[PDB]
Amino acid sequence: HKSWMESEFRVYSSANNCTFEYVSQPKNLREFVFKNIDGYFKIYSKHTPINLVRDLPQGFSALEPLVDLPIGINITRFQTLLALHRGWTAGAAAYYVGYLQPRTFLLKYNENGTITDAV
Amino acid sequence: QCVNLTTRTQLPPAYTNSFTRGVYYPDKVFRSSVLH
Amino acid sequence: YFPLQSYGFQPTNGVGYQPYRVVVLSFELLHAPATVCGPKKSTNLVKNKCVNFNFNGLTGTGVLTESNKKFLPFQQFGRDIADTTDAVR
Ligand SMILES: *[C@@H]1O[C@H](CO)[C@@H](O)[C@H](O)[C@H]1NC(C)=O
Ligand SMILES: *[C@@H]1O[C@H](CO)[C@@H](O)[C@H](O)[C@H]1NC(C)=O
Ligand SMILES: *[C@@H]1O[C@H](CO)[C@@H](O)[C@H](O)[C@H]1NC(C)=O
Known part of the structure:
Protein backbone atom coordinates (compact mmCIF):
# COMPACT_ATOMS: atom_id res chain seq x y z
CA HIS A 1 0.00 0.00 0.00
CA LYS A 2 4.41 0.91 4.59
CA SER A 3 3.50 -2.63 5.62
CA TRP A 4 3.70 -6.12 4.11
CA MET A 5 0.45 -8.10 4.36
CA GLU A 6 -0.49 -11.30 2.56
CA SER A 7 -3.92 -11.57 0.96
CA GLU A 8 -4.20 -14.21 -1.77
CA PHE A 9 -3.30 -17.79 -0.81
CA ARG A 10 -2.99 -19.92 -3.96
CA VAL A 11 -1.35 -23.11 -2.78
CA TYR A 12 -4.35 -25.43 -2.53
CA SER A 13 -8.06 -24.66 -2.51
CA SER A 14 -8.77 -26.87 0.53
CA ALA A 15 -8.51 -30.41 1.93
CA ASN A 16 -10.44 -32.96 4.00
CA ASN A 17 -8.05 -35.63 5.29
CA CYS A 18 -5.32 -34.08 7.55
CA THR A 19 -3.04 -36.42 9.54
CA PHE A 20 -0.15 -34.33 10.98
CA GLU A 21 0.15 -30.63 12.05
CA TYR A 22 3.08 -28.46 13.29
CA VAL A 23 3.34 -24.74 14.34
CA SER A 24 6.36 -22.42 15.03
CA GLN A 25 7.65 -19.08 13.58
CA PRO A 26 9.49 -18.21 10.28
CA LYS A 27 23.12 -11.19 0.52
CA ASN A 28 22.23 -14.70 1.75
CA LEU A 29 24.09 -17.94 1.19
CA ARG A 30 21.63 -20.48 2.57
CA GLU A 31 22.92 -23.95 1.70
CA PHE A 32 20.43 -26.75 2.30
CA VAL A 33 20.70 -30.53 1.95
CA PHE A 34 17.44 -32.48 2.22
CA LYS A 35 17.26 -36.20 2.97
CA ASN A 36 14.47 -38.77 3.16
CA ILE A 37 15.71 -42.12 4.50
CA ASP A 38 13.41 -44.84 5.89
CA GLY A 39 10.69 -42.24 6.36
CA TYR A 40 12.99 -40.18 8.58
CA PHE A 41 13.22 -36.85 6.76
CA LYS A 42 16.51 -35.21 7.77
CA ILE A 43 17.55 -31.74 6.60
CA TYR A 44 20.87 -29.90 6.89
CA SER A 45 21.52 -26.20 6.39
CA LYS A 46 24.24 -23.55 6.38
CA HIS A 47 23.61 -19.80 6.43
CA THR A 48 26.62 -17.88 5.20
CA PRO A 49 27.41 -14.13 4.87
CA ILE A 50 28.26 -13.74 1.19
CA ASN A 51 28.37 -10.55 -0.88
CA LEU A 52 28.60 -11.20 -4.62
CA VAL A 53 26.65 -10.96 -7.85
CA ARG A 54 26.18 -14.21 -9.70
CA ASP A 55 26.77 -17.96 -10.34
CA LEU A 56 27.81 -20.28 -7.48
CA PRO A 57 30.95 -19.22 -5.59
CA GLN A 58 33.74 -21.58 -4.69
CA GLY A 59 34.70 -22.39 -1.12
CA PHE A 60 33.79 -25.20 1.23
CA SER A 61 31.68 -25.52 4.36
CA ALA A 62 30.23 -28.26 6.53
CA LEU A 63 26.47 -28.54 7.04
CA GLU A 64 24.69 -28.85 10.32
CA PRO A 65 21.70 -31.01 11.33
CA LEU A 66 18.34 -29.31 11.86
CA VAL A 67 15.35 -31.65 12.23
CA ASP A 68 14.34 -35.33 12.04
CA LEU A 69 10.72 -36.01 11.11
CA PRO A 70 9.68 -39.63 11.85
CA ILE A 71 6.96 -39.37 9.20
CA GLY A 72 6.34 -42.14 6.68
CA ILE A 73 5.57 -40.10 3.52
CA ASN A 74 7.23 -41.63 0.40
CA ILE A 75 8.14 -38.27 -1.25
CA THR A 76 8.51 -38.78 -5.03
CA ARG A 77 8.61 -35.16 -6.24
CA PHE A 78 8.68 -31.59 -4.99
CA GLN A 79 8.58 -27.95 -6.06
CA THR A 80 9.51 -24.44 -4.92
CA LEU A 81 7.03 -21.66 -4.13
CA LEU A 82 7.74 -17.94 -3.74
CA ALA A 83 5.70 -14.84 -2.88
CA LEU A 84 4.89 -11.90 -5.14
CA HIS A 85 4.43 -8.18 -4.52
CA ARG A 86 1.81 -5.95 -6.15
CA GLY A 87 -0.15 -7.80 -12.85
CA TRP A 88 2.54 -9.50 -10.79
CA THR A 89 6.09 -8.89 -9.60
CA ALA A 90 8.42 -11.79 -8.85
CA GLY A 91 11.95 -10.55 -8.24
CA ALA A 92 15.38 -11.76 -9.35
CA ALA A 93 16.69 -14.85 -7.58
CA ALA A 94 19.11 -17.75 -7.92
CA TYR A 95 18.60 -21.25 -6.54
CA TYR A 96 20.37 -24.45 -7.55
CA VAL A 97 19.25 -28.09 -7.55
CA GLY A 98 21.44 -31.13 -8.00
CA TYR A 99 20.48 -34.63 -6.93
CA LEU A 100 22.90 -36.45 -4.65
CA GLN A 101 24.32 -39.84 -5.56
CA PRO A 102 25.63 -42.69 -3.38
CA ARG A 103 29.29 -41.72 -3.64
CA THR A 104 32.08 -42.30 -1.10
CA PHE A 105 34.18 -39.49 0.39
CA LEU A 106 37.24 -39.21 2.59
CA LEU A 107 36.90 -36.73 5.45
CA LYS A 108 39.55 -34.71 7.29
CA TYR A 109 38.47 -34.01 10.90
CA ASN A 110 40.77 -31.67 12.88
CA GLU A 111 41.18 -31.57 16.72
CA ASN A 112 38.04 -29.33 16.76
CA GLY A 113 36.11 -31.95 14.72
CA THR A 114 35.46 -29.30 12.06
CA ILE A 115 35.62 -30.82 8.57
CA THR A 116 38.38 -28.70 7.05
CA ASP A 117 38.72 -30.68 3.81
CA ALA A 118 37.19 -33.66 2.03
CA VAL A 119 38.21 -35.53 -1.13
CA GLN B 1 -9.35 -25.88 -13.58
CA CYS B 2 -8.21 -22.63 -11.95
CA VAL B 3 -6.91 -19.17 -12.84
CA ASN B 4 -3.22 -18.74 -13.59
CA LEU B 5 -0.84 -15.92 -14.47
CA THR B 6 0.02 -15.18 -18.09
CA THR B 7 2.77 -13.22 -19.87
CA ARG B 8 5.29 -15.58 -18.25
CA THR B 9 8.18 -15.79 -20.73
CA GLN B 10 9.81 -19.17 -20.14
CA LEU B 11 13.45 -18.53 -20.89
CA PRO B 12 15.39 -21.79 -21.36
CA PRO B 13 17.24 -22.79 -18.18
CA ALA B 14 21.02 -22.97 -18.12
CA TYR B 15 23.55 -25.17 -16.34
CA THR B 16 26.37 -24.37 -13.91
CA ASN B 17 29.04 -26.32 -12.02
CA SER B 18 29.61 -27.18 -8.37
CA PHE B 19 32.88 -26.49 -6.52
CA THR B 20 33.65 -28.65 -3.46
CA ARG B 21 29.98 -28.97 -2.54
CA GLY B 22 27.99 -31.61 -0.70
CA VAL B 23 30.22 -31.76 2.37
CA TYR B 24 28.03 -32.34 5.43
CA TYR B 25 28.56 -34.21 8.65
CA PRO B 26 27.42 -37.75 7.79
CA ASP B 27 26.44 -38.55 11.38
CA LYS B 28 26.11 -37.20 14.93
CA VAL B 29 29.59 -38.30 16.03
CA PHE B 30 32.64 -36.29 17.04
CA ARG B 31 36.12 -37.28 15.91
CA SER B 32 39.47 -35.51 16.25
CA SER B 33 42.59 -35.38 14.07
CA VAL B 34 41.54 -38.43 12.04
CA LEU B 35 40.59 -39.43 8.51
CA HIS B 36 37.36 -41.36 7.98
CA TYR C 1 -40.19 -47.84 13.52
CA PHE C 2 -37.69 -45.23 14.79
CA PRO C 3 -34.09 -46.60 15.03
CA PHE C 9 -31.46 -43.58 33.22
CA GLN C 10 -33.01 -42.84 36.67
CA PRO C 11 -31.04 -42.19 39.94
CA THR C 12 -33.23 -44.62 41.98
CA ASN C 13 -32.65 -47.73 39.78
CA GLY C 14 -30.20 -50.62 40.42
CA VAL C 15 -26.46 -49.95 39.79
CA GLY C 16 -26.76 -52.04 36.56
CA TYR C 17 -29.45 -49.66 35.18
CA GLN C 18 -27.35 -46.64 36.30
CA PRO C 19 -24.96 -45.26 33.59
CA TYR C 20 -21.33 -46.38 32.95
CA ARG C 21 -18.86 -44.27 30.88
CA VAL C 22 -16.97 -46.64 28.49
CA VAL C 23 -13.57 -45.26 27.31
CA VAL C 24 -12.14 -47.59 24.60
CA LEU C 25 -8.43 -47.22 23.60
CA SER C 26 -7.02 -49.12 20.57
CA PHE C 27 -3.26 -48.49 20.03
CA GLU C 28 -0.81 -49.91 17.42
CA LEU C 29 2.67 -51.50 17.85
CA LEU C 30 5.59 -52.23 15.43
CA HIS C 31 3.77 -50.39 12.55
CA ALA C 32 3.11 -46.79 11.32
CA PRO C 33 6.51 -45.11 12.16
CA ALA C 34 5.87 -43.82 15.65
CA THR C 35 5.86 -40.47 17.56
CA VAL C 36 4.19 -41.68 20.82
CA CYS C 37 6.34 -44.11 22.87
CA GLY C 38 5.78 -45.57 26.38
CA PRO C 39 6.98 -43.72 29.54
CA LYS C 40 10.48 -43.97 31.10
CA LYS C 41 12.24 -43.53 34.52
CA SER C 42 15.83 -42.34 35.29
CA THR C 43 18.68 -43.20 37.69
CA ASN C 44 21.55 -41.00 39.03
CA ASN C 56 21.25 -42.82 24.35
CA GLY C 57 20.89 -46.62 23.91
CA LEU C 58 24.71 -47.02 23.65
CA THR C 59 25.67 -49.73 26.21
CA GLY C 60 29.16 -50.17 27.74
CA THR C 61 31.12 -50.53 31.02
CA GLY C 62 34.13 -48.59 32.38
CA VAL C 63 35.42 -45.62 34.45
CA LEU C 64 33.57 -42.32 33.73
CA THR C 65 36.48 -39.87 34.32
CA GLU C 66 35.90 -36.10 33.77
CA ILE C 81 41.12 -43.81 15.17
CA ALA C 82 40.39 -47.46 16.16
CA ASP C 83 36.59 -46.75 15.90
CA THR C 84 35.80 -47.45 19.61
CA THR C 85 33.45 -45.22 21.70
CA ASP C 86 35.59 -43.39 24.33
CA ALA C 87 33.59 -40.13 24.73
CA VAL C 88 29.87 -39.15 25.03
CA ARG C 89 27.82 -36.02 25.94
C1 LIG D 1 -10.24 -37.91 1.55
O1 LIG D 1 -11.42 -37.10 1.62
C2 LIG D 1 -12.36 -37.35 0.59
C3 LIG D 1 -13.56 -36.41 0.75
O2 LIG D 1 -13.14 -35.06 0.55
C4 LIG D 1 -12.81 -38.80 0.61
O3 LIG D 1 -13.74 -39.05 -0.46
C5 LIG D 1 -11.62 -39.73 0.49
O4 LIG D 1 -12.06 -41.08 0.64
C6 LIG D 1 -10.64 -39.40 1.59
N1 LIG D 1 -9.47 -40.25 1.49
C7 LIG D 1 -8.95 -40.82 2.58
C8 LIG D 1 -7.68 -41.58 2.37
O5 LIG D 1 -9.48 -40.72 3.67
C1 LIG E 1 4.01 -45.16 1.26
O1 LIG E 1 3.80 -46.50 0.82
C2 LIG E 1 3.40 -47.35 1.90
C3 LIG E 1 3.19 -48.77 1.39
O2 LIG E 1 2.35 -48.76 0.23
C4 LIG E 1 2.15 -46.80 2.56
O3 LIG E 1 1.86 -47.62 3.70
C5 LIG E 1 2.35 -45.37 3.05
O4 LIG E 1 1.14 -44.87 3.61
C6 LIG E 1 2.79 -44.49 1.89
N1 LIG E 1 3.13 -43.17 2.40
C7 LIG E 1 2.81 -42.04 1.77
C8 LIG E 1 1.74 -41.21 2.42
O5 LIG E 1 3.34 -41.69 0.72
C1 LIG F 1 38.68 -25.88 19.43
O1 LIG F 1 39.25 -24.64 18.98
C2 LIG F 1 39.65 -23.70 19.97
C3 LIG F 1 40.29 -22.52 19.27
O2 LIG F 1 41.37 -23.01 18.46
C4 LIG F 1 40.64 -24.33 20.94
O3 LIG F 1 40.93 -23.41 21.99
C5 LIG F 1 40.08 -25.62 21.51
O4 LIG F 1 41.10 -26.25 22.30
C6 LIG F 1 39.65 -26.57 20.40
N1 LIG F 1 39.01 -27.71 21.02
C7 LIG F 1 39.35 -28.94 20.66
C8 LIG F 1 38.45 -30.03 21.17
O5 LIG F 1 40.33 -29.17 19.97
Whole structure:
Protein backbone atom coordinates (compact mmCIF):
# COMPACT_ATOMS: atom_id res chain seq x y z
CA HIS A 1 0.00 0.00 0.00
CA LYS A 2 4.41 0.91 4.59
CA SER A 3 3.50 -2.63 5.62
CA TRP A 4 3.70 -6.12 4.11
CA MET A 5 0.45 -8.10 4.36
CA GLU A 6 -0.49 -11.30 2.56
CA SER A 7 -3.92 -11.57 0.96
CA GLU A 8 -4.20 -14.21 -1.77
CA PHE A 9 -3.30 -17.79 -0.81
CA ARG A 10 -2.99 -19.92 -3.96
CA VAL A 11 -1.35 -23.11 -2.78
CA TYR A 12 -4.35 -25.43 -2.53
CA SER A 13 -8.06 -24.66 -2.51
CA SER A 14 -8.77 -26.87 0.53
CA ALA A 15 -8.51 -30.41 1.93
CA ASN A 16 -10.44 -32.96 4.00
CA ASN A 17 -8.05 -35.63 5.29
CA CYS A 18 -5.32 -34.08 7.55
CA THR A 19 -3.04 -36.42 9.54
CA PHE A 20 -0.15 -34.33 10.98
CA GLU A 21 0.15 -30.63 12.05
CA TYR A 22 3.08 -28.46 13.29
CA VAL A 23 3.34 -24.74 14.34
CA SER A 24 6.36 -22.42 15.03
CA GLN A 25 7.65 -19.08 13.58
CA PRO A 26 9.49 -18.21 10.28
CA LYS A 27 23.12 -11.19 0.52
CA ASN A 28 22.23 -14.70 1.75
CA LEU A 29 24.09 -17.94 1.19
CA ARG A 30 21.63 -20.48 2.57
CA GLU A 31 22.92 -23.95 1.70
CA PHE A 32 20.43 -26.75 2.30
CA VAL A 33 20.70 -30.53 1.95
CA PHE A 34 17.44 -32.48 2.22
CA LYS A 35 17.26 -36.20 2.97
CA ASN A 36 14.47 -38.77 3.16
CA ILE A 37 15.71 -42.12 4.50
CA ASP A 38 13.41 -44.84 5.89
CA GLY A 39 10.69 -42.24 6.36
CA TYR A 40 12.99 -40.18 8.58
CA PHE A 41 13.22 -36.85 6.76
CA LYS A 42 16.51 -35.21 7.77
CA ILE A 43 17.55 -31.74 6.60
CA TYR A 44 20.87 -29.90 6.89
CA SER A 45 21.52 -26.20 6.39
CA LYS A 46 24.24 -23.55 6.38
CA HIS A 47 23.61 -19.80 6.43
CA THR A 48 26.62 -17.88 5.20
CA PRO A 49 27.41 -14.13 4.87
CA ILE A 50 28.26 -13.74 1.19
CA ASN A 51 28.37 -10.55 -0.88
CA LEU A 52 28.60 -11.20 -4.62
CA VAL A 53 26.65 -10.96 -7.85
CA ARG A 54 26.18 -14.21 -9.70
CA ASP A 55 26.77 -17.96 -10.34
CA LEU A 56 27.81 -20.28 -7.48
CA PRO A 57 30.95 -19.22 -5.59
CA GLN A 58 33.74 -21.58 -4.69
CA GLY A 59 34.70 -22.39 -1.12
CA PHE A 60 33.79 -25.20 1.23
CA SER A 61 31.68 -25.52 4.36
CA ALA A 62 30.23 -28.26 6.53
CA LEU A 63 26.47 -28.54 7.04
CA GLU A 64 24.69 -28.85 10.32
CA PRO A 65 21.70 -31.01 11.33
CA LEU A 66 18.34 -29.31 11.86
CA VAL A 67 15.35 -31.65 12.23
CA ASP A 68 14.34 -35.33 12.04
CA LEU A 69 10.72 -36.01 11.11
CA PRO A 70 9.68 -39.63 11.85
CA ILE A 71 6.96 -39.37 9.20
CA GLY A 72 6.34 -42.14 6.68
CA ILE A 73 5.57 -40.10 3.52
CA ASN A 74 7.23 -41.63 0.40
CA ILE A 75 8.14 -38.27 -1.25
CA THR A 76 8.51 -38.78 -5.03
CA ARG A 77 8.61 -35.16 -6.24
CA PHE A 78 8.68 -31.59 -4.99
CA GLN A 79 8.58 -27.95 -6.06
CA THR A 80 9.51 -24.44 -4.92
CA LEU A 81 7.03 -21.66 -4.13
CA LEU A 82 7.74 -17.94 -3.74
CA ALA A 83 5.70 -14.84 -2.88
CA LEU A 84 4.89 -11.90 -5.14
CA HIS A 85 4.43 -8.18 -4.52
CA ARG A 86 1.81 -5.95 -6.15
CA GLY A 87 -0.15 -7.80 -12.85
CA TRP A 88 2.54 -9.50 -10.79
CA THR A 89 6.09 -8.89 -9.60
CA ALA A 90 8.42 -11.79 -8.85
CA GLY A 91 11.95 -10.55 -8.24
CA ALA A 92 15.38 -11.76 -9.35
CA ALA A 93 16.69 -14.85 -7.58
CA ALA A 94 19.11 -17.75 -7.92
CA TYR A 95 18.60 -21.25 -6.54
CA TYR A 96 20.37 -24.45 -7.55
CA VAL A 97 19.25 -28.09 -7.55
CA GLY A 98 21.44 -31.13 -8.00
CA TYR A 99 20.48 -34.63 -6.93
CA LEU A 100 22.90 -36.45 -4.65
CA GLN A 101 24.32 -39.84 -5.56
CA PRO A 102 25.63 -42.69 -3.38
CA ARG A 103 29.29 -41.72 -3.64
CA THR A 104 32.08 -42.30 -1.10
CA PHE A 105 34.18 -39.49 0.39
CA LEU A 106 37.24 -39.21 2.59
CA LEU A 107 36.90 -36.73 5.45
CA LYS A 108 39.55 -34.71 7.29
CA TYR A 109 38.47 -34.01 10.90
CA ASN A 110 40.77 -31.67 12.88
CA GLU A 111 41.18 -31.57 16.72
CA ASN A 112 38.04 -29.33 16.76
CA GLY A 113 36.11 -31.95 14.72
CA THR A 114 35.46 -29.30 12.06
CA ILE A 115 35.62 -30.82 8.57
CA THR A 116 38.38 -28.70 7.05
CA ASP A 117 38.72 -30.68 3.81
CA ALA A 118 37.19 -33.66 2.03
CA VAL A 119 38.21 -35.53 -1.13
CA GLN B 1 -9.35 -25.88 -13.58
CA CYS B 2 -8.21 -22.63 -11.95
CA VAL B 3 -6.91 -19.17 -12.84
CA ASN B 4 -3.22 -18.74 -13.59
CA LEU B 5 -0.84 -15.92 -14.47
CA THR B 6 0.02 -15.18 -18.09
CA THR B 7 2.77 -13.22 -19.87
CA ARG B 8 5.29 -15.58 -18.25
CA THR B 9 8.18 -15.79 -20.73
CA GLN B 10 9.81 -19.17 -20.14
CA LEU B 11 13.45 -18.53 -20.89
CA PRO B 12 15.39 -21.79 -21.36
CA PRO B 13 17.24 -22.79 -18.18
CA ALA B 14 21.02 -22.97 -18.12
CA TYR B 15 23.55 -25.17 -16.34
CA THR B 16 26.37 -24.37 -13.91
CA ASN B 17 29.04 -26.32 -12.02
CA SER B 18 29.61 -27.18 -8.37
CA PHE B 19 32.88 -26.49 -6.52
CA THR B 20 33.65 -28.65 -3.46
CA ARG B 21 29.98 -28.97 -2.54
CA GLY B 22 27.99 -31.61 -0.70
CA VAL B 23 30.22 -31.76 2.37
CA TYR B 24 28.03 -32.34 5.43
CA TYR B 25 28.56 -34.21 8.65
CA PRO B 26 27.42 -37.75 7.79
CA ASP B 27 26.44 -38.55 11.38
CA LYS B 28 26.11 -37.20 14.93
CA VAL B 29 29.59 -38.30 16.03
CA PHE B 30 32.64 -36.29 17.04
CA ARG B 31 36.12 -37.28 15.91
CA SER B 32 39.47 -35.51 16.25
CA SER B 33 42.59 -35.38 14.07
CA VAL B 34 41.54 -38.43 12.04
CA LEU B 35 40.59 -39.43 8.51
CA HIS B 36 37.36 -41.36 7.98
CA TYR C 1 -40.19 -47.84 13.52
CA PHE C 2 -37.69 -45.23 14.79
CA PRO C 3 -34.09 -46.60 15.03
CA LEU C 4 -33.20 -44.06 17.78
CA GLN C 5 -34.94 -44.51 21.16
CA SER C 6 -33.92 -42.51 24.27
CA TYR C 7 -32.30 -43.97 27.43
CA GLY C 8 -34.33 -43.92 30.69
CA PHE C 9 -31.46 -43.58 33.22
CA GLN C 10 -33.01 -42.84 36.67
CA PRO C 11 -31.04 -42.19 39.94
CA THR C 12 -33.23 -44.62 41.98
CA ASN C 13 -32.65 -47.73 39.78
CA GLY C 14 -30.20 -50.62 40.42
CA VAL C 15 -26.46 -49.95 39.79
CA GLY C 16 -26.76 -52.04 36.56
CA TYR C 17 -29.45 -49.66 35.18
CA GLN C 18 -27.35 -46.64 36.30
CA PRO C 19 -24.96 -45.26 33.59
CA TYR C 20 -21.33 -46.38 32.95
CA ARG C 21 -18.86 -44.27 30.88
CA VAL C 22 -16.97 -46.64 28.49
CA VAL C 23 -13.57 -45.26 27.31
CA VAL C 24 -12.14 -47.59 24.60
CA LEU C 25 -8.43 -47.22 23.60
CA SER C 26 -7.02 -49.12 20.57
CA PHE C 27 -3.26 -48.49 20.03
CA GLU C 28 -0.81 -49.91 17.42
CA LEU C 29 2.67 -51.50 17.85
CA LEU C 30 5.59 -52.23 15.43
CA HIS C 31 3.77 -50.39 12.55
CA ALA C 32 3.11 -46.79 11.32
CA PRO C 33 6.51 -45.11 12.16
CA ALA C 34 5.87 -43.82 15.65
CA THR C 35 5.86 -40.47 17.56
CA VAL C 36 4.19 -41.68 20.82
CA CYS C 37 6.34 -44.11 22.87
CA GLY C 38 5.78 -45.57 26.38
CA PRO C 39 6.98 -43.72 29.54
CA LYS C 40 10.48 -43.97 31.10
CA LYS C 41 12.24 -43.53 34.52
CA SER C 42 15.83 -42.34 35.29
CA THR C 43 18.68 -43.20 37.69
CA ASN C 44 21.55 -41.00 39.03
CA LEU C 45 24.87 -39.86 37.46
CA VAL C 46 27.90 -41.65 39.04
CA LYS C 47 31.53 -41.02 37.91
CA ASN C 48 35.16 -42.14 38.51
CA LYS C 49 34.30 -45.78 39.49
CA CYS C 50 34.37 -48.90 37.24
CA VAL C 51 30.58 -48.80 36.57
CA ASN C 52 28.08 -49.93 33.89
CA PHE C 53 26.45 -47.10 31.85
CA ASN C 54 23.70 -46.65 29.21
CA PHE C 55 23.57 -43.25 27.41
CA ASN C 56 21.25 -42.82 24.35
CA GLY C 57 20.89 -46.62 23.91
CA LEU C 58 24.71 -47.02 23.65
CA THR C 59 25.67 -49.73 26.21
CA GLY C 60 29.16 -50.17 27.74
CA THR C 61 31.12 -50.53 31.02
CA GLY C 62 34.13 -48.59 32.38
CA VAL C 63 35.42 -45.62 34.45
CA LEU C 64 33.57 -42.32 33.73
CA THR C 65 36.48 -39.87 34.32
CA GLU C 66 35.90 -36.10 33.77
CA SER C 67 36.28 -35.17 30.07
CA ASN C 68 38.71 -32.48 28.82
CA LYS C 69 37.46 -31.97 25.21
CA LYS C 70 34.37 -30.10 23.90
CA PHE C 71 32.54 -31.24 20.73
CA LEU C 72 30.17 -29.52 18.26
CA PRO C 73 26.86 -28.70 20.06
CA PHE C 74 24.80 -31.28 18.06
CA GLN C 75 27.26 -34.25 18.28
CA GLN C 76 26.53 -36.92 20.95
CA PHE C 77 29.53 -39.31 20.62
CA GLY C 78 33.35 -39.02 20.45
CA ARG C 79 35.50 -41.79 18.94
CA ASP C 80 39.19 -42.67 18.31
CA ILE C 81 41.12 -43.81 15.17
CA ALA C 82 40.39 -47.46 16.16
CA ASP C 83 36.59 -46.75 15.90
CA THR C 84 35.80 -47.45 19.61
CA THR C 85 33.45 -45.22 21.70
CA ASP C 86 35.59 -43.39 24.33
CA ALA C 87 33.59 -40.13 24.73
CA VAL C 88 29.87 -39.15 25.03
CA ARG C 89 27.82 -36.02 25.94
C1 LIG D 1 -10.24 -37.91 1.55
O1 LIG D 1 -11.42 -37.10 1.62
C2 LIG D 1 -12.36 -37.35 0.59
C3 LIG D 1 -13.56 -36.41 0.75
O2 LIG D 1 -13.14 -35.06 0.55
C4 LIG D 1 -12.81 -38.80 0.61
O3 LIG D 1 -13.74 -39.05 -0.46
C5 LIG D 1 -11.62 -39.73 0.49
O4 LIG D 1 -12.06 -41.08 0.64
C6 LIG D 1 -10.64 -39.40 1.59
N1 LIG D 1 -9.47 -40.25 1.49
C7 LIG D 1 -8.95 -40.82 2.58
C8 LIG D 1 -7.68 -41.58 2.37
O5 LIG D 1 -9.48 -40.72 3.67
C1 LIG E 1 4.01 -45.16 1.26
O1 LIG E 1 3.80 -46.50 0.82
C2 LIG E 1 3.40 -47.35 1.90
C3 LIG E 1 3.19 -48.77 1.39
O2 LIG E 1 2.35 -48.76 0.23
C4 LIG E 1 2.15 -46.80 2.56
O3 LIG E 1 1.86 -47.62 3.70
C5 LIG E 1 2.35 -45.37 3.05
O4 LIG E 1 1.14 -44.87 3.61
C6 LIG E 1 2.79 -44.49 1.89
N1 LIG E 1 3.13 -43.17 2.40
C7 LIG E 1 2.81 -42.04 1.77
C8 LIG E 1 1.74 -41.21 2.42
O5 LIG E 1 3.34 -41.69 0.72
C1 LIG F 1 38.68 -25.88 19.43
O1 LIG F 1 39.25 -24.64 18.98
C2 LIG F 1 39.65 -23.70 19.97
C3 LIG F 1 40.29 -22.52 19.27
O2 LIG F 1 41.37 -23.01 18.46
C4 LIG F 1 40.64 -24.33 20.94
O3 LIG F 1 40.93 -23.41 21.99
C5 LIG F 1 40.08 -25.62 21.51
O4 LIG F 1 41.10 -26.25 22.30
C6 LIG F 1 39.65 -26.57 20.40
N1 LIG F 1 39.01 -27.71 21.02
C7 LIG F 1 39.35 -28.94 20.66
C8 LIG F 1 38.45 -30.03 21.17
O5 LIG F 1 40.33 -29.17 19.97
